[PDB]
Each structure stands twice: as C-alpha cells, then as structure tokens.
Symmetry: D2
Subunit: 127 residues, 4 copies
Amino acid sequence: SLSAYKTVVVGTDGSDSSMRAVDRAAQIAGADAKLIIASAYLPTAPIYEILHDAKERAHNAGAKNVEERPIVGAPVDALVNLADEEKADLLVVGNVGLSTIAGRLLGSVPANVSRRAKVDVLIVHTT
Amino acid sequence: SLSAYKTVVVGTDGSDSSMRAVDRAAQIAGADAKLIIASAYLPTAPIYEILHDAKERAHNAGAKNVEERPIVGAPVDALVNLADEEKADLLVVGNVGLSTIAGRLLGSVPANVSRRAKVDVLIVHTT
Amino acid sequence: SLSAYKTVVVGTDGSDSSMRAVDRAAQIAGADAKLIIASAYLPTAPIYEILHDAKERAHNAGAKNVEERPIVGAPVDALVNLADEEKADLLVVGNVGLSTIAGRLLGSVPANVSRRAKVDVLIVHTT
Amino acid sequence: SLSAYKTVVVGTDGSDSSMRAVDRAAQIAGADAKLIIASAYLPTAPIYEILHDAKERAHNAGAKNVEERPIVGAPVDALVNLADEEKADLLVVGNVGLSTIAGRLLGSVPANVSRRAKVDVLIVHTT
C-alpha cells in the first residue's frame, strides 16, 4: 500500500537524450510532488541556461513544483547529499554511454539493458 | 504529453526486497497497464508458488492486468527477450547485493547509489 | 616504459573464488612486490584465520612479501583508503555475483564478461 | 600452481587512455605470450591505422607476438567471442567515462574505483 513519489530529482546536462529523462520525471512528479532538476557544473554561467530550459520543459510536461540546482564537485557524492538533504525518494537520469570496446565493457548492466531493450529500468531500494 | 507506462515487467525471487519491488511495480501499473511478474528458474515447481504470491501482492496493491512468467536460462538475455516480445516500457527490480570487498567492488553505481541514499533509481532510455 | 606492479592489494572472504584471486595476485606480486591481503569484517575473530590461511596460500604461490589487513566499515571506501595509504598500483578480487534476475540486472558489465568468457579482466587507470 | 598469462587481448580506440592500456597489456604479454590488439569497427581504414599505431607501441613496450584484429558488431559480444575463439586468459581496457551526473551514476564500481584511487583493477574469473 505504498504511496506515490513525493520528491523527485532528475539530472540533466542539456542533451536531447537528457531532456527525455526530464519529461519522464515531470510526468511522475506531476502537480503534487516536488521536482528538483540538477546539472553538474563541469567548468552568468551557461549551466543556468540549461537549468532554466529544463525547468521550462518540466512545466510544459506537467510538473508544477519545480526547482533547479547545480551539482558541484564529484557528481555522485553531491547527488547522494542532495537526496539526503531533500529527502528524495526517486532519482532519475537519461541513459548514456560510449560505443567503444572500453566504453561498453566498463558499463553497468542496468544501463546496458536499458539500451539493449530500449526500455526504462527502475531500481527499488530495500529498507 | 507523456503518458503512463503500458507494459511493466518486475522481477522477484520471493524475498522481502523483491516484494517491495512488486509493490512499487503494481502501484505504477495500476489499472490501465499490463504488469508481468517474472522470476528466474534455478533449481509443480516451487517457483509457481512464488509467482502466485507475487501476483496476489500485485492485486492487493492495485494492479489489475497481472500475469506471471518464469524466466529460463540466462536471466538477463531472457528478460531482454521478454521485454521485446511484450513491448515492455519499464523493467523493475528490488536492490540487492553482497557486502564483501568483491561483492561491493564488482557492482554497479546505480545499485550502489540506490542503497547509499535509500532511494529508488530510474534509468530512462533514449531514442 | 611501464614497470611491474610493486604494491598489490587483493580481497578475500575465504571462499574458493577468492582463493583463486589470491593465487593470481600472489603470482603477480612474486618476490619483488608487496602483497597486501584484505578481508571485510562483517560482524580471536574468525576473520584472522581466513587472513592467516590466505597468507599461507599466497606464500605457496611464490609471493615472498605478504601482509594481512582487515577492512572495516563500508568496504569500497576502506579499500580506496588502503590503496591511497599503501600507494597500491593494482587491486585484485575474485569475481562473484547473484544468479537471480535482480542479481544479474544490477551487476557490472566487466564482471559479467569475466563470467561469460571465463576470463580475467584488467582495468588500466589513466592520468 | 598458476603461471603467467599466455593470450592477452586489449581493446583500443587510439585515445591516450587506450595507449596506456596497450603498454600495460604488452608489459604482461612480454615475449612468451600472445598480445591481441582489438578495436571496434564502425562504433587505408581509420581502424587499421589505429591498430597499426597500437602494434608499434606494443612492440616497443616489449610485446613479441602481436596481431591486429578489428571487432565487428556489438563490441562486448564480439570481445566475448574473440576471447573464446583465441582462448584468451586476460582482457585489458583503458578506463574511460563521462563526468556528467548520468555518466558517473550509470557507470560500474570497478571503473569508478579505478578512477578514484588512480589504480588498476583486476577481476579474476572463477571455475
């Protein structure tokens, strides 16, 4: 008798593939959940334009409670910290990878399956 | 303009973790989506009792169009095969892993982040 | 003109796969390199017997300079710390995994290939 | 007991990263082992030139028995096939990855640890 996701965080770097993850995250967050869009600062900084556009796409997709957020430093650690400070219950990202031997050999199976079967993959954490 | 998922496939082994994944999967499939519950066969077989209970769990969660299906041979290839044959647009599994050096060192980052942040992780496929 | 590995760290939980990784790590360390054998502490603690035996097997494999080390807390973070503290140049682990749908879906590709092609995999870091 | 590797394979795309992995693979191949350099085809031919540059770097690294070999189709499967056809006992790749939120979140832990500790990672298969 679980409840719907209340705090969704989605990462975007502005790529077209990335925007699809934003849309899906928007559809899930809807009008009752909080949607946080994040982007890693690799280098007004250009990231803010990416966040703004992403925030607009989210609104057009149905997300009413949207906010942007730059990620600083080692992205994954920052993301985990964000999830904890915002008590996120769902994290979303768009699949991506390299078509080279190394790029593929060093990947993760979930990302691989997602690409192989052109499907989305959901990992449910355990208490 | 994104609509909800139509064909949701979830994996389970009968453990507690798997049941949470089933709940979440059911909650998403709801009533207007097809929910296929899969389980890997690895020695009527006891797997059918697990699939039956999971099926009832999916029902007690809101899933209507529920159906069970045993996974045979290499589970990933089978799963990829099942999704392609059923036009699935969402695969779901409960997180799981080993806590030994090798167990943790050989895993995937999404699995790891899911555990560290006690949050679910969604990988959205691209074109 | 890259030279041979000088400081090798291998992890073991005392299983048979792990012991094979110990033999391989020992074969690489030989008589001119330092071999550090690590094991994650989960719970004289039983971990010391496992370490002692691993040390014995390393010697019988030609490794002259071998020391044991218990790993505490989150395993990967402890391993990264050890590698930094001992200036390691090669980490070794025996492949391992779960055979359930989730176990396989959440794994890494390098571990998958290792099992698929029954071969050892080596990831070379970059600057 | 165990003996050094006899058939070593190493993928490369010509990148600086790949070249470092070539050097390491060659250092291991030495003179009494065969080094098979591989490169994905279609991720006087661009791929053949890369393979040429690799054979030369390998030779200088101390590799005696070297041989170029283009990979066709999905790199991983081809690599797995190549491994079995050549009965390779070791695969080598240069660590590579994306720095975006998705890029790091979707990677594998072995690749990640290799980057964090700037160390090489070896996964020993079981039997």
